[PDB]
Amino acid sequence: STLKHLAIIMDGNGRWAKLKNKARAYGHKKGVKTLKDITIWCANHKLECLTLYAFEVDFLMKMLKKYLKDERSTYLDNNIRFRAIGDLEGFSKELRDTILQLENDTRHFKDFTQVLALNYGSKNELSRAFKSLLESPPSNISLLESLENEISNRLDTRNLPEVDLLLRTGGEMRLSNFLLWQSSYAELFFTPILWPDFTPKDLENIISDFYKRVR
Amino acid sequence: TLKHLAIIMDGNGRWAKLKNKARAYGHKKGVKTLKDITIWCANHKLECLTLYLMKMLKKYLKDERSTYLDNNIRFRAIGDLEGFSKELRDTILQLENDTRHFKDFTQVLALNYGSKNELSRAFKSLLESPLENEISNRLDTRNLPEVDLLLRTGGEMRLSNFLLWQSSYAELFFTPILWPDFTPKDLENIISDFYKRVRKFGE
Numbered sequence: 001s002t003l004k005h006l007a008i009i010m011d012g013n014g015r016w017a018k019l020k021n022k023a024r025a026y027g028h029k030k031g032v033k034t035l036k037d038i039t040i041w042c043a044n045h046k047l048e049c050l051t052l053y054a055f056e057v058d059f060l061m062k063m064l065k066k067y068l069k070d071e072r073s074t075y076l077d078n079n080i081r082f083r084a085i086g087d088l089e090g091f092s093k094e095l096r097d098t099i100l101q102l103e104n105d106t107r108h109f110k111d112f113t114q115v116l117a118l119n120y121g122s123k124n125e126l127s128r129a130f131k132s133l134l135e136s137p138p139s140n141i142s143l144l145e146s147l148e149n150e151i152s153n154r155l156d157t158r159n160l161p162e163v164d165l166l167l168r169t170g171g172e173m174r175l176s177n178f179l180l181w182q183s184s185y186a187e188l189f190f191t192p193i194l195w196p197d198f199t200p201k202d203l204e205n206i207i208s209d210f211y212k213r214v215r
Numbered sequence: 216t217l218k219h220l221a222i223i224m225d226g227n228g229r230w231a232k233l234k235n236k237a238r239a240y241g242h243k244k245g246v247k248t249l250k251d252i253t254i255w256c257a258n259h260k261l262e263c264l265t266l267y268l269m270k271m272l273k274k275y276l277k278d279e280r281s282t283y284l285d286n287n288i289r290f291r292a293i294g295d296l297e298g299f300s301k302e303l304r305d306t307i308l309q310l311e312n313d314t315r316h317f318k319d320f321t322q323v324l325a326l327n328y329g330s331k332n333e334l335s336r337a338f339k340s341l342l343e344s345p346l347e348n349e350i351s352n353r354l355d356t357r358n359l360p361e362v363d364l365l366l367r368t369g370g371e372m373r374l375s376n377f378l379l380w381q382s383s384y385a386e387l388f389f390t391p392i393l394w395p396d397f398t399p400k401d402l403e404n405i406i407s408d409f410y411k412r413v414r415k416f417g418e
């Protein structure tokens with residue numbers, strides 16, 4: 001209702017693997033099932049938007065694409081639109097290619113959207129928004145003074161609602177250059193629970209608290 | 216490593232209603248908290264402290280001018296000053312001029328301030344006269360360090376459009392303590408916690 005856009009910094013993966021004394025890989029892979037579960041739950045709960053802070057480099061981008069071509073099927077099956085934010089220009093044509101395609105393919109779903117922040121940084125997003133305005137100004141730029149609406153509409157998140165609740169798992173209490181502009185009035189939630197241990201139940205408890213705050 | 220502390224001072228009104236006192240009373244108490252915390256930060260060698268109805272502002276600036284001069288506290292205002300009267304805008308500018316020569320610690324008051332508007336003005340400026348660093352250097356906080364610790368008193372847990380860019384990697388603290396009741400000792404407890412967080416991430 002009042003909660004339309006939930007954003008999450010999924011922290012605690014590698015660390016969750018460490019307490020089980022395991023290699024970094026085990027951790028993230030599990031982190032990936034939570035992501036799936038959490039998104040499906042949000043999809044089935046009338047959330048309008050969920051943004052997740054996704055993140056030798058060529059290799060990571062290999063796994064990403066695999067990751068996306070793999071679950072491509074789960075976006076269609078649960079009616080979930082896909083959107084990527086971040087500096088995609090720094091991607092291999094192949095990844096940028098699969099990214100753009102999953103977007104095309106899912107642009108049909110309008111109820112729930114899952115946004116993945118990839119090679120994402122808020123200061124960088126704002127910098128690119130600025131470059132966007134300098135390179136292609138609004139035609140009436142001359143008659144303008146306040147540019148907030150103009151910036152809002154050039155950010156990677158244009159047309160998504162603002163963030164209502166920004167959650168960070170894993171124990172740390174910092175925004176980490178994530179959706180700074182979009183979370184200007186978001187309710188902030190923090191939990192020590194590591195990401196791979198995070199459940200829809202835990203998220204249900206947090207949402208319950210959210211409503212309590214929202215007098 | 217704590218160089219820039221920023222604080223959202225909230226709870227003055229709620230504090231006055233609890234005490235069945237007039238708002239002005241909660242504001243007067245709040246100004247006393249602001250003064251004590253500012254002096255504490257200067258004595259503890261922070262580089263910068265940023266703090267987030269005009270009646271009280273002109274009075275404060277007039278009455279407190281002497282405390283700045285008497286404690287080597289440089290004063291700077293951030294925010295949209297055009298939205299102020301000639302008189303007020305001039306008094307703010309004059310206090311900055313009166314204290315620009317103090318170079319160790321700066322108290323920054325965010326007046327008619329919002330981050331989105333600050334970024335808007337910086338963007339307008341760059342478009343007009345042409346990246347992260349360029350933007351950073353056109354913000355109102357241009358010659359200050361990034362925020363190391365952003366604290367919000369009063370109980371709410373939201374950034375409220377305050378120093379969003381500058382607090383990108385700041386450690387966030389929240390306390391239910393209402394601003395008029397907040398003391399230097401409370402801040403001392405928060406800062407010991409800050410240093411403990413810093414030890415823990417590297418551990």
